[PDB]
Amino acid sequence: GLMQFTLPVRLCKEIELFHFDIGPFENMWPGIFVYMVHRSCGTSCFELEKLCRFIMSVKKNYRRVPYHNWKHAVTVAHCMYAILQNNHTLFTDLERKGLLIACLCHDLDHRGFSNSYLQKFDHPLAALYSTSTMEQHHFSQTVSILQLEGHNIFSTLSSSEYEQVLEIIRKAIIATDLALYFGNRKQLEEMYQTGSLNLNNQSHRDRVIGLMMTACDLCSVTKLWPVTKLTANDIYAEFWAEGDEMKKLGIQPIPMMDRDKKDEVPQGQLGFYNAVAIPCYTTLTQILPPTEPLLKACRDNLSQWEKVIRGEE
Template sequence: MSSVAECTACLILRHYYFCFHQGEVAHILCQPIVQPDGTLAAVLELWRREAGGSFHEEDEEITCSYLVWGGIALHYAHLYFNMDKQRKLNDFLLAVVKSIFQDMVSMDMLIMKIMNFAQRLVDADRASLFLVDSKNKELYATIFDVGIENKTSGDDTESENEETVKAHTSREIRFPLGTGIAGQVAMTGEILNISDAYSDERFNRTVDQLTGYRTQTILCMPIYIRGSIIGVVQMVNKHTGCFSKEDEEAFEMFAVYCGLALHHAKLYDKIRRSEQKYKVALEVLSYHNSCSEEEFHSAVKDGIPGQVVDIDDYYFNPFVIEDYEKARQSIYMFIDLFGLVRFDKNSLLKFVLTVRKNYRRVPYHNWTHGFSVANCMYSIIKHSDNAFRPNECLALFIGALCHDLDHRGKNNKFMLDTESPLAAIYSTSTMEHHHFNQTVTILQQEGHNIFSKLSSSEYKQVLGLIKHCILATDLALFFPNKAKLNQIVQDQSFSWSNQDHRMLIQAIAMTASDLSASAKPWDIQSETVKIIFEEFYQQGDAERAAGRKPIPMMDRNQPEQQAASQVGFLMGICVPCYTLLYSLIPETKPLLNMCKENLEKWRQIDEDMRKREQ
């Protein structure tokens, strides 16, 4: 019944009480007030003193016609009352959501907010929020007893009577599921509205004994997320009377938002902890995977390296110099190409030494391979008559040097098939994205940023080009790149002034450098192939251990596949790559020539092997 109807009923009762006790004799006309839907809204009673005479049929008809409109009025008053009540509840819940999700700082702060809002919602004296520990089958809370108090007027910093939230208990409390009212709610999911706590056998008096507080009325409700109970909110001691059905309904709606907020707060805490763990891991990584002070000082003492014989030859043999000398020759090649005017020498030394350290000791994709690819790119740049612009050359050389950083000796398909964490982070070009990010990580280490003297626009351009160059080493991208560039060349529309065309030739140059072992003289080529297949076989072993059958090329039980696989690899990928590169940069012809020579030798080996098998 609406407040209007309630007031009408009250007036009738008061008048009836007065007339009865005054001893007056009255004639009574009683009529129902019916709402449009047929439900009884109220009852109207009219009294008339004896002198006024009795009510007539005409009086009944008149009052009946008026009361039709009275029923409609009461109906709309009732609707307005409910709508206004719902609007206030919605406004309150909106304020709750804004406050909870805008200021999500920590779980404890969120819990304080939830309990504060819950108290206001149902006019409770105290609030408790317990979270479910599913592993130990317990309820726990670090802040479980919160009340709203008025500040005294003696507080100069706040206005008089301002409400504040006070945590009466801030030590952790734990108890088994099923213990007390909250434990019962957590076990059953049932809402409990208790008007006398001490007369309820489920009530656990331990908390009162610990806090010195007297619990009288309780409204306790579960908090769900994804169908599971994650906590329990308990309101204690309504300020006026007992908790009503309306309190339950409003509180139940509020609990939905509590569940969402707690769920997101847990995610927020996990993310924040993960960030801190990442920072710690990065600190450890930067310490152990950075060049040591001894290595750096040794490189400084050794001075700027001189040129090794034939370092700019496409057929340079990377196996003739040891790892440290490879680092020194990488420094030489960088200085030879770019000088030191725009670059800090100490940063360059640290960067190259740390890059060397971040290549893993796998059979093929190791520091020797990284150096070889950089050496091939150095030779292309040196002999290509300024085909590439300065910042493009910088990105090509650094991209080549870093293109396989932290390679694990397994290909992208293996990472995806084994659901590697890297594959979860990068769904395409998995390892290549990782190599680029490792490059950026090294650049971000103190004293390693070789681009620190570049302008911000240059820095951004070079970093973008390095990413493009490293991603281009994914052979899955080679085929579309080759198809696009081939079409442009066939149409005789290639232009060095077209940025898209330049990006394509950069990608092809990166692939050519990455595959440069196939364009080395036969003794280097054959030795490198042995190393490549050892890495393939290690991946095949890992696949077999995981219950999968490796492809023949990666099956160490099928060594006879080596020659055939090399023929297919050189014909399908290497020769087309070097042919395309030669068509635009004629100075790279030695790469194409040697690749074709190696192809013929592998063909001969494959034919001889087939004849022996017949």
Template sequence: MFIDLNLVEKFRINHEVLCRWVASVKRNYRPVSYHNWRHAFNVCQSCFCMIKTGGLESIFSDYEKLSLLVSCLSHDLDHRGTNNAFQAKIEHPLARLYSTSTMEHHHYNQCLMLLQSEGCEILSHLTSSEYAHVIKLVQHAILSTDLAIYFKKRNEFFNVVKSGAADWLGNDGHRELLR
């Protein structure tokens, strides 16, 4: 997917580093029933298909494509198989650390940790401003997987689409909803 979207060449991602990063992401998924590596890979494959066959390749920038693939693969890292409400009810340390979107903040922080791990730095050739931009997009994408946020944004998205006023290229708010 990274190769087919020309992201490896565009961002000068070393093939070995990419493979090591993907293997590290896979290893950091727990063997839970649903929020596991297979689920993450399926989400990434679905996103890739939407980009390639859904007309999004010409809409999204290379930075957005990169951030979406990274986000899809990382969006449930170290998931414990329980939801945010459960984490809060048992007063898990993660719930004390993050007051909202508990698990999603944890997944995002796990993603950052892996991206910064020695030998897994797939973003190492980005400038500091490019890196900050990609990380901001990754953060937004992963935090948006909190179902409380997702259902709110889903309604906004469908309202934009139904209105016929969707401007994926010129309206940053619409573009954010699409991502």
């Protein structure tokens, strides 16, 4: 009960900034997460014995894929931690509890392939879940780990609070399906502009938590240029592996997934920033002004990709 986690001074400070990189020392990532829960949520939120056992079971159910791995889970949780610490009073106790867990669990048992590839492969998960295929599986794996003896970190909630927290987690993890992001952002765009956006309307909060999830999930593009650029190799390692598996099923993949078209990555990253990432953090910054450092870092990285295209890197 009187047992804080405490990080070294450089991490104690930098962990508060949106652009913090959790480092290459895997054995520090559990303590980084517990640190973030204790400051976001309280030392009372979870039984440490149970939390520690839930964290290690979650870690074990992430695979050693180049991008959708345990490091991504912890990175996406740290971005959520930063959004919550910069928007103290906008979020319920339950919401802070559920969102840090949802971010940690959001890509559980990812295999490094998209929903599209599962459907073209005719994977069993595509018969069980016809839309948001991986995301419905990530939520399923979250509930399975919650039900392991010793792992129920929510056991001290009332029955109704327990149902609300699992419902926050389920919607948060489904919202990480980027196919749903485009419509969720448009609707938040219209509601903010026409002035109907109302954070006491549950269906409105849901949409806002959905956009926060998309912002956390895409947060590679909000790091300092050297982090963003070196991790871009991890995401293309997966895309191009999926492209190779497309060609083995007799299907030309899209260019993003075709390693023969590596040359056009710079222009492909431009599209992504322009069509997805900049719109995401713009609409987030309109709803939650203290998240503006994410939009500023995203814009800095777009401008670094523009320099790549102009032959200056």
